[PDB]
Amino acid sequence: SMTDQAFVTLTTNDAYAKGALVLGSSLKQHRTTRRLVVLATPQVSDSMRKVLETVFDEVIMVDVLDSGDSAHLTLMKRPELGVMLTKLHCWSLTQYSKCVFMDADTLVLANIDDLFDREELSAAPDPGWPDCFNSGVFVYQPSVETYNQLLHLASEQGSFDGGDQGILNTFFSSWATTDIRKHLPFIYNLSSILPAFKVFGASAKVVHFLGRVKPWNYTYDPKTKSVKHPEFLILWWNIFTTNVLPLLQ
Amino acid sequence: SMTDQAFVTLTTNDAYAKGALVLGSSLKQHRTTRRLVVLATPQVSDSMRKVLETVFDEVIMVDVLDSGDSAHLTLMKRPELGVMLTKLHCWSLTQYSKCVFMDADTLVLANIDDLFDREELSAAPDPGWPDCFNSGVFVYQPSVETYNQLLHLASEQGSFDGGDQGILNTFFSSWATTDIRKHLPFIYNLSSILPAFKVFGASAKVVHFLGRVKPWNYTYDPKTKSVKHPEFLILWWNIFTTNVLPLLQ
Ligand SMILES: O=c1ccn([C@@H]2O[C@H](COP(=O)(O)OP(=O)(O)O)[C@@H](O)[C@H]2O)c(=O)[nH]1
Ligand SMILES: O=c1ccn([C@@H]2O[C@H](COP(=O)(O)OP(=O)(O)O)[C@@H](O)[C@H]2O)c(=O)[nH]1
Ligand SMILES: [Mg+2]
Ligand SMILES: [Mg+2]
Ligand SMILES: [Mn+2]
Ligand SMILES: [Mn+2]
């Protein structure tokens, strides 16, 4: 296998854990040759970590509240940024030479191992402000150096919405104007879920359920096989019910 | 002056004419050294053309209903596409070596003559599907060849929404993946009118009132100096009342 490269996702709770299980299961379904990693916190229940270990190759515990954690000092300056400081540990994974970070609210529809042809920092434009890249799917190179610099920036600048996108766009500020090969096609992070979707949505590789209501916040009804287009939402729930639930033997 | 280069806009009626007057007036305010051109149709009233001649250097009449018009045969195949076939005449203006097309629902906030450093086809990403460029602001090279090919594509493919963006994106299909210098910064076509705008909206060069309701569809009240943020909307109306109305001596 490519033991040197991984898909890396994050969950700080049992709800986003359901996302990660669907993401990981979807990467396996499309036969990734790379490792699957999930960053998890002590807020994820032991019982959920046991399920995550059935999908992920590594469940890596990160606890920013631990005084021995690399991000703990930054957290005392910015106590509102625990989730994003947890996310930033993706750069601490120096056992890998290259990774694709994916949000736990994403879902893979095709093999996307060709993302490992890209260099740090390759990412898709954010709908709404497309000179910024969306931080939900990105190719990067773990580095303690880069990690510490992102921590400093988080300390200095903070994050109005608690997300990492501003910080990552501030650090990787040449993305908009430099090297078109670092622009991932939008189909690798399809996040604006009429006429553009009717022509190109069929070729989506990754769906991103960006925004307030996540697929797992819906109530699924087996009797109608529907939540109470929801095309993508139905596919999420199809993977969950078909591929995830039976991992619980 | 740069008699060889122009800003080119379009109006097929008196309502969008008000847009063009505000756009043209804004380009003059920021001291363009280029020519100002408006493509107009016989549906624009003579009285409005007289006002347009006070702002524009050239009011160029285009009538796709005239059997001598270059786009007339295409219109008989696609009678629903009169406006976009009118727009496509922007490529017939071979008296200019290079032009910036701007929609009549745009407004300039700074000198943007440095767009003439760009090559065809340079355009900003469309919010919502950012691997397509928005066809409301673009750098191009007039050519009868290119014109005829866009006409053919319009004939072959049509336009579901009546706009030209699909056609232009189909013809200039390498835009997303090739030559980052052909990606205009989003501030040259700021069309998604909270946190990204709070950091970068102040540096906007062009505002685009993309979507259903246009600034001139609002009712302005002098007693409150408001329509019945609307920051951009207020600036539109400020240019209209301050700079446009008094051109009517
Ligand atoms: O309470 C939270 C909030 C977010 N996340 C992680 O952070 C990512 C970014 O958050 P989200 O996708 O909700 O942001 P959006 O994509 O909606 O802006 C998620 O996918 C998760 O991987 C998490 O683990 N716990
Ligand atoms: O009836 C019309 C519709 C559109 N236009 C022109 O076509 C451009 C594109 O239309 P619009 O800006 O309304 O499309 P949007 O930017 O909202 O998608 C306008 O700015 C005008 O220049 C026109 O002259 N008459
Ligand atoms: Mg510093
Ligand atoms: Mg043909
Ligand atoms: Mn997300
Ligand atoms: Mn427009």
Side-chain angles (χ1 to χ4, degrees), chain A residues 1-193 195-196 199-228 230-247 249, chain B residues 1-193 195-196 199-228 230-247 249:
Chain A
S1 74
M2 265 293 189
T3 55
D4 195 31
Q5 299 180 334
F7 291 94
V8 180
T9 197
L10 165 69
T11 185
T12 72
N13 62 49
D14 285 4
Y16 281 86
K18 289 187 272 187
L21 290 166
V22 171
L23 173 55
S25 298
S26 71
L27 284 159
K28 290 185 155 293
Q29 183 189 16
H30 293 288
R31 301 187 175 82
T32 189
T33 52
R34 271 67 176 185
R35 306 285 284 169
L36 297 181
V37 172
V38 58
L39 300 170
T41 72
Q43 169 179 22
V44 184
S45 66
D46 280 359
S47 53
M48 185 58 75
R49 287 175 234 171
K50 295 173 207 143
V51 187
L52 289 166
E53 296 166 348
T54 76
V55 175
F56 293 83
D57 298 312
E58 310 294 353
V59 175
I60 302 177
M61 300 308 300
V62 173
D63 186 4
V64 295
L65 299 172
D66 179 2
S67 57
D69 185 72
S70 52
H72 186 75
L73 291 179
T74 302
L75 181 78
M76 283 186 305
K77 297 264 172 59
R78 301 285 182 180
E80 78 282 3
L81 300 185
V83 174
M84 73 88 73
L85 289 172
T86 306
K87 181 171 170 173
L88 292 180
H89 285 62
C90 70
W91 264 277
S92 307
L93 305 180
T94 54
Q95 66 270 46
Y96 306 112
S97 59
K98 189 179 292 190
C99 298
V100 179
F101 183 84
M102 298 186 77
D103 269 10
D105 65 327
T106 59
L107 171 276
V108 173
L109 300 167
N111 184 283
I112 58 167
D113 287 353
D114 62 5
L115 286 174
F116 295 97
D117 294 350
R118 309 274 176 161
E119 301 181 297
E120 175 175 281
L121 184 296
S122 299
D126 205 29
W129 198 282
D131 282 358
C132 293
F133 61 81
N134 182 266
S135 63
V137 178
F138 64 83
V139 191
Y140 73 102
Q141 174 179 118
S143 166
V144 165
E145 160 91 84
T146 299
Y147 179 63
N148 289 330
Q149 298 201 309
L150 293 173
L151 283 185
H152 169 59
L153 205 57
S155 183
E156 253 182 28
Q157 175 180 297
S159 176
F160 186 87
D161 70 6
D164 68 308
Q165 186 163 303
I167 293 301
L168 300 190
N169 276 271
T170 302
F171 186 79
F172 296 111
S173 57
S174 72
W175 177 85
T177 53
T178 305
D179 195 356
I180 195 48
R181 294 169 300 182
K182 290 190 185 165
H183 287 228
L184 296 183
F186 191 56
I187 58 174
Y188 286 96
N189 187 356
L190 172 22
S191 70
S192 56
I193 60 176
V199 184
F200 299 108
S203 74
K205 290 172 187 268
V206 176
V207 181
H208 183 185
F209 297 89
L210 173 149
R212 273 206 322 112
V213 185
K214 297 311 186 189
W216 56 87
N217 297 136
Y218 287 84
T219 291
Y220 183 81
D221 180 7
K223 302 197 261 185
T224 59
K225 298 190 173 51
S226 69
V227 295
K228 295 179 163 176
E231 176 189 316
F232 301 123
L233 205 39
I234 289 169
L235 181 38
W236 190 98
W237 274 103
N238 178 69
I239 295 179
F240 187 71
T241 61
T242 302
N243 306 121
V244 174
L245 287 202
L247 298 162
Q249 303 107 312
Chain B
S1 74
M2 265 293 189
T3 55
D4 195 31
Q5 299 180 334
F7 291 94
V8 180
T9 197
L10 165 69
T11 185
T12 72
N13 62 49
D14 285 4
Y16 281 86
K18 289 187 272 187
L21 290 166
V22 171
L23 173 55
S25 298
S26 71
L27 284 159
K28 290 185 155 293
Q29 183 189 16
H30 293 288
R31 301 187 175 82
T32 189
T33 52
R34 271 67 176 185
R35 306 285 284 169
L36 297 181
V37 172
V38 58
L39 300 170
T41 72
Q43 169 179 22
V44 184
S45 66
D46 280 359
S47 53
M48 185 58 75
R49 287 175 234 171
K50 295 173 207 143
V51 187
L52 289 166
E53 296 166 348
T54 76
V55 175
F56 293 83
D57 298 312
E58 310 294 353
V59 175
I60 302 177
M61 300 308 300
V62 173
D63 186 4
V64 295
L65 299 172
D66 179 2
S67 57
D69 185 72
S70 52
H72 186 75
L73 291 179
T74 302
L75 181 78
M76 283 186 305
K77 297 264 172 59
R78 301 285 182 180
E80 78 282 3
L81 300 185
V83 174
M84 73 88 73
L85 289 172
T86 306
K87 181 171 170 173
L88 292 180
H89 285 62
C90 70
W91 264 277
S92 307
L93 305 180
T94 54
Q95 66 270 46
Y96 306 112
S97 59
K98 189 179 292 190
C99 298
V100 179
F101 183 84
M102 298 186 77
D103 269 10
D105 65 327
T106 59
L107 171 276
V108 173
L109 300 167
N111 184 283
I112 58 167
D113 287 353
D114 62 5
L115 286 174
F116 295 97
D117 294 350
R118 309 274 176 161
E119 301 181 297
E120 175 175 281
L121 184 296
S122 299
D126 205 29
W129 198 282
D131 282 358
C132 293
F133 61 81
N134 182 266
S135 63
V137 178
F138 64 83
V139 191
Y140 73 102
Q141 174 179 118
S143 166
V144 165
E145 160 91 84
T146 299
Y147 179 63
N148 289 330
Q149 298 201 309
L150 293 173
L151 283 185
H152 169 59
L153 205 57
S155 183
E156 253 182 28
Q157 175 180 297
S159 176
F160 186 87
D161 70 6
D164 68 308
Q165 186 163 303
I167 293 301
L168 300 190
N169 276 271
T170 302
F171 186 79
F172 296 111
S173 57
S174 72
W175 177 85
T177 53
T178 305
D179 195 356
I180 195 48
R181 294 169 300 182
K182 290 190 185 165
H183 287 228
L184 296 183
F186 191 56
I187 58 174
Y188 286 96
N189 187 356
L190 172 22
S191 70
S192 56
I193 60 176
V199 184
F200 299 108
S203 74
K205 290 172 187 268
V206 176
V207 181
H208 183 185
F209 297 89
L210 173 149
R212 273 206 322 112
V213 185
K214 297 311 186 189
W216 56 87
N217 297 136
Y218 287 84
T219 291
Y220 183 81
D221 180 7
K223 302 197 261 185
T224 59
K225 298 190 173 51
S226 69
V227 295
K228 295 179 163 176
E231 176 189 316
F232 301 123
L233 205 39
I234 289 169
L235 181 38
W236 190 98
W237 274 103
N238 178 69
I239 295 179
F240 187 71
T241 61
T242 302
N243 306 121
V244 174
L245 287 202
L247 298 162
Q249 303 107 312

